Design a protein around this nucleic acid. Structure first.
Lengths: 120, 255, 109, 115, 143
RNA sequence: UAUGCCAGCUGGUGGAUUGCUCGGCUCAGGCGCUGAUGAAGGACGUGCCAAGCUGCGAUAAGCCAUGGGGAGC
RNA sequence: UACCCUCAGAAGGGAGGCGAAAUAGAGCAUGAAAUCAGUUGGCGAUCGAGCGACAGGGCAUACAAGGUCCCUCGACGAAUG
RNA sequence: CUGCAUGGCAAGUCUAACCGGAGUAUCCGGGGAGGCACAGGGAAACCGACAUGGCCGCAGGGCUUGCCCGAGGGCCGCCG
RNA sequence: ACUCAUACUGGUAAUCGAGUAGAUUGGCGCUCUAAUUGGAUGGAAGUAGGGGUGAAAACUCCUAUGGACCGAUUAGUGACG
């Protein structure tokens, strides 16, 4: 726990606050909690979501890493930032869906919660 | 990318690649456990006599004279009961615990959480700021993986290393070494004596099978070989990016 | 305030001025009853922002080297230097003293 | 050396042949030449220069030998003591220098044509 | 930490002098039985009880897996490309087991399948594995 | 203002403290049997003066030869 | 540790000498506390005992490192019926 | 053995002894034996599961500002 | 409330301020090894007495003594209180 963790949380503090939506504030909180809390991810359900939210032209960030343990998004571009995800999650969430990003990127982007999904 | 330099210091072949475990995350936490642990496996073994403060013949007289049951007879007040405290309690002891020398002083580490902080260690090597953050001073603001050529293996005498350090720019670092042995005050004076035996860390030279003879002597430099580098040399005393030079052969283990 | 002192310090020799609590058993000072004087409690002294201050008003502290005065300014006691005991001697507290240069006043010596 | 007990243990207790070394001093700066050799064993019939403690810059014939003690005397190296009997103080080799060698022997352990 | 601070407080741990020493009695767990208030307090960990489960056949000369669930396979195909090798027709089956330790090769059916639809061949398959298989595509295996 | 209380000062007593390490403790590499040809082991002797230890054995802290070493012992 | 004085005395003591240092002088650097001798400050032979804490007086101790403080007058002026 | 905090990697993860190299107790490369996880139930024979069907709804998001979508969570259903 | 901040600054507490056992949290020490890095005859460690800091384990300075060694940070080590 150190540098990567610190900067990122701090950055998405100057996101919620400078701009609007609470995401990028909430995400700070999750990280600012025990590791054995976050993520989880498993790209399954980072797809069809219990909530109406799911795939669409919007990202679905996850607080935590994303992992590949299932199918991938369909035709929709829906690809999202998260704290780093490795393995099939990444390079699988590619092509179909969209390309995953750093989430720092999700921090430099449109600030202000845009169409985004929690997708824990 | 990495840029190779010849033993002239002029821009030379300037060829890459960098390794891929250079991209490593960098964890000083993980690094600190493994090599600090390594330090632990260095301490010598000693013990207390198996039967010290056990030869009895000490009994406690029962009640009568105001006394505490002990057993404390023999040689005046004493006993082997571990509790030999000031005042009314006597001395003599028993089980100071538990130290027996045969205890396999060692360490506990997982394999993965060992050479994961090896490829972190080397990782925060090539970096810039956390190169010169913990110590090391080099003019070269640019890339500091510090490759060389396969030659440099051959350089017999240091001086010539000295010429090619000044021309790299890193070389100020050796100027900023303890550049002398400093006795260390405090404990360690008695034990393994840190004493005068001390100096700042320096350059680190990584090479292939051989270790560079004409480099080892230097202000505070250590020499190692790719197949053998540990988490200690890289990241000396739980820190990160020591300055480092790699022959371009001993790219890295890369494996 | 009143010099706190552990009770009967000036009775049995070895006991020292260093104060501590009183034993719970009816031990005069405990059970505050007058004459015992003490029962140190928060509320006596320690004004804030001047808890430790030279009477001069200069925070004056620690110098065990001549690096100990780094950029220390002898104006308003960011570092108002004092040489520690257990400093070598004149040789040491010579180029210690002679701090005088950058304005830093050293207490004795 | 610096091994441990060794290099020390077998040092002081040994031998009546090795002892020749341990009592060796430097030559002059004429004597270094005039037969190469940085240092000699120092003999009773030699000359020395003190360069060192208590007597610095003065020398007379060795007037002594060693053995177990690896020490030698000088001329009037020392004197008065409480006992009342002048006893020279044994010193070095280390501190001493040899600025004169007496080779009664034709061959002084090949301090010539060394190879 | 708290443990680090030991001095400063007489008695460490439970406060008391002549405090907890060898107690309550017996060694390790007290007798699993009644004692004069030594140990008891109605229990039922155990109840039944001879720790571990064991089967005599279970051992050598015992049946062995591997078993595969009809989830990984569908996940495997067609949704994502995977082992290009061993790919033919819309799909095919074969060894995709961590171990081909023998006496094995069944495929269970759980999750949603066929979906591939996939045809599989392996040692015997469970009933709820034929279905959601033979349905869209899939069929006989390892005759 | 004796007898005397408390604190300091000078001197002492005592040997803490700090600094020092010819000793320990522990790990590691190598190496590894001796004795009736008396270890082996023990006894008693043996020195100018010799009680202990070591060494020796009535040739008795020793005798001879070769080699090494060297001006002391 | 010469010489000299003292002494029953090759003891010990005094004085003296050596050394950077003898509280390095012989089972021999630094030299704490308990404690002892002498001495300085405070109290003291009509007065009461957890020995002190907090507050205030007596007496006691150049510079430095602190620089304030008192009186009259005046300006400001909360709560105070 | 069971928690917790931090960190790596993740449907996987870690090597053990040991091997090679070397700067030679560190260290770099190798080694996956084997362990735990990836399916459970049953004494056993033996059989073998929800990559989501419904409803509430926190955070968050959307909207034309009460109405939507609603991971997690909660309540059912269904399955071995 | 602002903020990366548990650093500042401003704000609220009539509805905060006692505490044995115990739970929680901020502020350890010892040996020797290694890397980085410092101190010492212009006087180290130790010791005695005294000043300052830390809730605290403990850290630090001054004076005397002592007369050669002594630390800090990080990673280890263990005949570690």
């Amino acid at each position: 726990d150190n540098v990567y963790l610190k900067l990122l949380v701090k950055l998405y503090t100057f996101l919620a606050r400078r701009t609007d939506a609470p995401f990028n504030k909430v995400v700070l909180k999750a990280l600012f909690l025990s590791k054995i809390n976050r993520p989880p991810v498993s790209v399954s359900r980072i797809a069809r979501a219990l909530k109406q939210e799911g795939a669409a032209n919007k990202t679905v960030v996850v607080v935590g890493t994303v992992t590949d343990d299932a199918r991938i998004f369909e035709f929709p571009k829906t690809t999202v930032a998260a704290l780093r995800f490795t393995a099939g999650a990444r390079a699988k969430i590619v092509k179909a869906g969209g390309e995953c990003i750093t989430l720092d990127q999700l921090a430099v982007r449109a600030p202000k919660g845009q169409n985004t999904l929690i997708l824990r | 990318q990495v840029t190779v330099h010849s033993l002239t210091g002029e821009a030379t072949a300037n060829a890459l690649p960098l390794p891929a475990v250079f991209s490593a995350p960098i964890r000083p936490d993980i690094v600190h456990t493994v090599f600090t642990s390594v330090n632990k496996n260095k301490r010598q073994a000693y013990a207390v006599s198996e039967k010290a403060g056990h030869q009895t013949s000490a009994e406690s007289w029962g009640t009568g004279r105001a006394v505490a049951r002990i057993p404390r007879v023999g040689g005046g007040g004493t006993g082997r009961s571990g509790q030999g405290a000031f005042g009314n309690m006597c001395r003599g002891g028993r089980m100071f615990a538990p130290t027996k020398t045969w205890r396999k002083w060692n360490v506990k580490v997982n394999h993965n959480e060992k050479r994961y902080a090896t490829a972190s260690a080397i990782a925060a090597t090539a970096v810039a700021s956390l190169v010169l953050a913990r110590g090391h001073r080099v003019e070269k603001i640019p890339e500091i993986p510090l490759v060389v050529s396969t030659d440099l293996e051959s350089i017999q005498k240091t001086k010539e290393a000295v010429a090619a350090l000044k021309a790299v720019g890193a070389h100020s670092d050796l100027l900023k070494v303890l550049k002398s042995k400093k006795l260390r005050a405090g404990k360690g004076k008695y034990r393994n004596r840190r004493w005068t035996q001390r100096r700042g860390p320096l350059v680190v030279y990584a090479e292939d099978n051989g270790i560079v003879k004409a480099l080892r002597n230097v202000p505070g430099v250590e020499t190692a070989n790719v197949a053998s580098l540990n988490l200690l040399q890289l990241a000396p005393g739980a820190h990160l990016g020591r300055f480092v030079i790699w022959t371009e052969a001993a790219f890295t283990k890369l494996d | 305030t009143k010099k706190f002192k552990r009770h009967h310090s000036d009775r049995y020799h070895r006991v020292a001025e260093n104060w501590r609590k009183q034993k719970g058993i009816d031990s005069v000072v405990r059970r505050r009853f007058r004459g015992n004087i003490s029962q140190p409690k928060i509320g006596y002294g320690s004004n804030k922002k001047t808890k430790f201050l030279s009477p001069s008003g200069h925070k004056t502290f620690l110098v065990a080297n001549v690096k100990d005065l780094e950029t220390l300014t002898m104006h308003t006691k960011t570092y108002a230097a004092e040489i520690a005991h257990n400093i070598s001697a004149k040789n040491r507290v010579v180029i210690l003293a002679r701090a005088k240069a950058l304005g830093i006043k050293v207490t004795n010596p | 050396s610096s091994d441990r007990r060794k290099a020390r243990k077998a040092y002081f207790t040994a031998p009546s042949s090795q002892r020749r070394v341990l009592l060796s001093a430097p030559l002059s700066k004429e004597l270094r030449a005039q037969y190469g050799i940085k240092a000699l064993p120092i003999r009773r019939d030699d000359e020395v220069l003190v360069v060192r403690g208590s007597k610095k810059g003065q020398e007379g014939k060795i007037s002594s030998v060693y053995r177990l003690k690896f020490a030698v005397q000088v001329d009037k190296v020392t004197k008065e003591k409480v006992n009342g009997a002048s006893v020279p103080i044994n010193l070095h080799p280390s501190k001493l220098v040899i600025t004169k060698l007496h080779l009664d022997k034709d061959r002084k352990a090949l301090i010539q044509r060394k190879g | 930490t708290k443990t680090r601070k030991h001095r400063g407080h007489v008695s460490a741990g439970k406060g008391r002098i002549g405090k907890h020493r060898k107690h309550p009695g017996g060694r390790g767990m007290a007798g699993g039985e009644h004692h004069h208030r030594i140990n008891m307090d109605k229990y039922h960990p155990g109840y039944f009880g001879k720790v571990g489960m064991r089967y005599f056949h279970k051992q050598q000369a015992h049946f062995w897996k591997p078993v595969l669930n009809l989830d990984k396979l569908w996940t495997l195909i067609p949704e994502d490309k995977r082992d290009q090798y061993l790919k033919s027709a819309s799909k095919e089956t074969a060894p995709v087991i961590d171990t081909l330790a023998a006496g094995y090769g069944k495929i269970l059916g759980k999750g949603r399948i066929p979906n591939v639809p996939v045809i599989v061949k392996a040692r015997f398959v469970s009933k709820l594995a034929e279905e959601k298989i033979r349905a869209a595509g899939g069929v006989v295996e390892l005759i």
